[PDB]
Design a protein around this ligand. Structure first.
Ligand code: M3U
Ligand code: M3U
Lengths: 369, 369
C-alpha cells in the first residue's frame, strides 16, 4: 500500500521549484502515489511548465489572490485545503517556501494530523515586517513542519538554532537547479538568439523599485560603455517598459543597435536564453542561485549580498550599484577568457541538480519505506 | 497621546489570569488607554470576575467552540478579531496561554501589523501532538509575539533555546497570583467557615482521572486517621460524588461532623477558603502554583510532580496516593508547627504577586513611553 504524497503548487514560480520533485516522486510508483494539488489563480505558464515536466494535476483549487485581502486568502485557502486533504487523505503534504498558501496548507495538514515536508526551509531575516508576510509565513510553516529541506547550510543552521529536531533537517540544495536538466533544450529558437547570432550576450535583470533612480542610470551608462568597448557583444534587458524607463533608456542607451530592452521572458525562455549567455548582470536571488549551474558568470548589482556562499565559491561577484565597478568587472570578464572560464567552471554551492533525490530519500526513510 | 493596549479574554479560566493585568493597566490612565475584548463562550463566571475587578468590556464576540471544528473556530475567530482590531486600532494586543483563540488573535494582530504580547509564554512539551492542538498553538503564537511574559526561568529558557531575542523575554511570574490581593477579602463568610472555629482547616481537592478508585479510598482512610489523631482539625472536600462514591466516603469517615463533603467552590469562594486553610492536599497543577502565595503548605496527591520549582523551593511536597505516605506527611505538618510554619513561609517561585506590574513596565519601556 503506497505512501500517498500530496505536492502543493500554490503559485507560478513554485511550478519550476516543485515540478522536479514531482518527477522524482513519479519514479517510485511501487512505493509512492504522487498527488499534485494546484491552487494558483494564474495557470497558463504553470500549465506550460507542468506540460514540459509531464505532470497532470490531480486537484485544482482556485484560491483567488488579485485584489484579495490576507484574511480572505487565509480563510478560503484554509477551508479548501482542509477539504482536499479530507478528500485525498495523503500521508504527507509537501509545501514550498514562504507563501501564505504554504502557511495555511501547513495549518490544514496540522488540523488533520498530516505530516508536512517543507521545501526550501530556514531562510530568516528575523524582521516580521520585511518581507511581509513572507518572513512570518516561513517561521509559522517552520513550527508545523515535520521535515525541513534547506537549500544551504546557512538555512539548515537557522532551524537548528530554533531547536528543531536535527534528524528532520536536510541540506538538499535548491530544487530550481534540478529543473534545468529538463527545461534547457540542446536546441532552442527565440528572437533574442536569432538577433544574437555568434555575438556574446550579456543578459541583465534588475528589479525596477530597488534600482529606481541613480542605480539604473549607472547600469545604463555602464552597459553603454561595454558595447562601446566590445563590438561582438549584445546586452539584453528583459523588463516591463513604462515611459519612465523608455525615456531613461533612450536618453543614455541610444539606438546603436546592440542594446535591446525586451518584454519579460517566461521561465522556459529565460532558462534557455540564460543557458546561452556569456555573462549575467542581476539583482535576483534566484538568478544568483540558478544561473551558475548553466556555466554563466553572474555579477550582482548590489553593494551588499545575502548570498555569501556564491561569492566565496566564485560563481558570483559583487558589482555594486556604481557605474565604474559595474563596467570594470563586466569588461574584465568580457576581455579575459581565463577570468570568464574560472567563474564559469566554479561549482554552484546552492545545488548539484539532485535536491529532489535527497528530498524523496528523506521522505522514504522517514516513513521506513 | 496614549498607548492603546488591548487585552483578550478568550476562555473562562483567563478571567482570573488577565483581570489583574487589566487592573494594572487601569492604574496608568494618562499613558495607557486600556481596551478589553471578551471572546469566551461561557460568560457567567467571567462576568462575575470582571465585575469584582471593576472591568467593563469594550468588545464582546461570541466565538462558539461547542461541537465546533478547529477550521471554523480559526476562520470565524480570525474574521471577528480582525474586525475588532481594524476598529479599535490597538498599539499592542495581549494574549494568554495556549488556546486556538490566542493563536488567531495573534494572527489577526500580525495581519494588521499590530504587536503582540504573550502572557504566560514558554511552556514546552516539544511534542507537536501532545497536547493537541495546545503545544502547536503556543509555538505559533511564539513566533508571532513581540514580547514574551514567562512565568518561570524554565519557560524563558525554552524560548531562549528557540533563538528568541532575550531582550523580548521577561520572567514576570504567574499573573493568577496577582489576583489574590483583589479576590481575598478579610471580611468574607462561608457556611463551611462558620462551622470551623479557631480549628485548623485541611482543604482537600482531587479531580484527576488517575485518582479515581483506590487513590480516593486511600485519601479518605488517611483523613479518617488524621481527624482521629488531631481533635482540633476539620477537613473540607469540595467535590461532587456519584452516590456509590458518597457511600464509600461515609463508610470510611462516618458522620462525626468534622469532615465536610460539599459541592465544588467557585474561584472566589475557593480563594478565600484556601486563604483560611492550615494545610492543602491537591492533585491540581494550578493550586500548586497559587495556593502557596497564601502561606498554605501544599501536599500533592501524586507520586511525581509537574511543578519541580515548587518542590525545590519547599512550597510543595509529594504525598503519593498510598494511604501511609498521605497520612505520614499530613500528620508531620499537623503535629509540628515548625515544619508547617516553614512551608507556610517559603517563597512561591511561580510569582510574588507583581507579574502584572512587570508586564506593564515591559510594555511602557518597549514603546518608549
Ligand atoms: C527567484 N527569482 C526568479 O524568479 C529567477 C529565476 C530565474 O533565474 C534563473 F534562470 F537563473 C528567472 N528569475 C528572475 O529573477 C528573472 C528576472 N528578470 C527577468 C526578466 N524576464 N524573466 C526574468 C526572470
Ligand atoms: C487548575 N487550576 C485551577 O483551576 C485552580 C486555581 C485555584 O487554585 C488556587 F486558588 F490555588 C482553584 N483551582 C482548582 O484546581 C480547584 C480545585 N478544587 C476545587 C474545588 N472547588 N473549586 C476548586 C478549584
Amino acid at each position: 500500500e503506497r505512501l500517498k504524497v500530496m505536492t502543493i503548487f500554490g503559485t507560478r514560480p513554485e511550478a519550476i521549484k516543485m515540478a522536479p520533485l514531482v518527477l522524482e516522486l513519479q519514479k517510485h510508483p511501487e512505493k509512492i502515489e504522487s498527488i499534485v494539488t494546484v491552487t494558483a489563480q494564474h495557470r497558463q505558464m504553470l500549465d506550460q511548465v507542468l506540460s514540459i515536466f509531464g505532470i497532470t494535476p490531480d486537484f485544482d483549487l482556485n484560491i483567488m489572490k488579485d485584489r484579495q485581502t490576507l484574511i480572505d486568502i487565509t480563510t478560503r485557502g484554509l477551508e479548501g485545503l482542509d477539504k482536499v486533504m479530507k478528500e485525498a487523505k495523503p500521508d504527507i503534504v509537501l509545501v514550498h517556501g514562504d507563501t501564505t498558501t504554504t502557511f495555511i496548507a501547513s495549518l490544514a495538514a496540522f488540523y488533520n494530523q498530516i505530516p508536512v515536508g517543507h521545501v526550501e526551509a530556514g531562510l530568516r531575516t528575523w524582521d516580521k515586517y520585511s518581507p511581509y508576510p513572507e518572513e512570518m509565513n516561513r517561521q509559522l510553516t517552520g513550527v508545523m513542519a515535520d521535515l525541513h529541506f534547506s537549500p544551504t547550510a546557512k538555512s539548515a543552521t537557522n532551524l537548528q538554532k530554533e531547536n528543531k529536531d536535527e534528524s528532520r533537517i536536510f541540506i538538499t540544495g535548491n530544487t530550481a537547479i534540478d529543473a534545468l536538466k529538463t527545461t534547457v533544450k540542446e536546441t532552442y529558437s527565440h528572437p533574442v538568439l536569432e538577433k544574437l547570432g555568434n555575438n556574446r550576450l550579456v543578459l541583465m535583470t534588475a528589479h525596477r523599485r530597488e534600482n529606481l533612480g541613480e542605480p539604473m542610470r549607472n547600469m545604463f551608462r555602464a552597459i553603454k560603455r561595454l558595447v562601446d568597448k566590445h563590438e561582438d557583444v549584445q546586452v539584453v534587458y528583459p523588463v516591463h517598459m513604462n515611459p519612465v524607463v523608455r525615456e531613461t533608456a533612450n536618453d543614455i542607451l541610444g539606438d546603436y543597435g546592440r542594446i535591446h530592452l525586451i518584454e519579460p521572458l517566461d521561465v522556459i525562455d529565460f532558462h534557455n536564453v540564460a543557458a546561452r549567455s556569456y555573462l549575467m548582470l542581476t539583482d535576483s536571488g534566484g538568478v544568483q542561485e540558478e544561473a551558475p549551474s548553466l556555466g554563466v558568470p553572474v555579477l550582482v548589482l548590489r553593494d551588499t549580498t545575502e548570498r555569501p556562499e556564491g561569492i566565496e565559491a566564485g560563481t558570483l561577484k559583487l558589482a555594486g550599484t556604481d557605474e565604474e565597478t559595474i563596467f570594470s568587472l563586466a569588461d574584465e570578464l568580457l576581455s579575459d577568457k581565463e577570468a570568464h572560464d574560472k567563474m564559469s567552471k566554479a561549482s554552484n554551492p546552492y545545488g548539484d541538480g539532485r535536491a529532489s533525490e535527497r528530498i524523496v530519500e528523506a521522505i522514504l526513510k522517514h516513513f521506513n519505506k
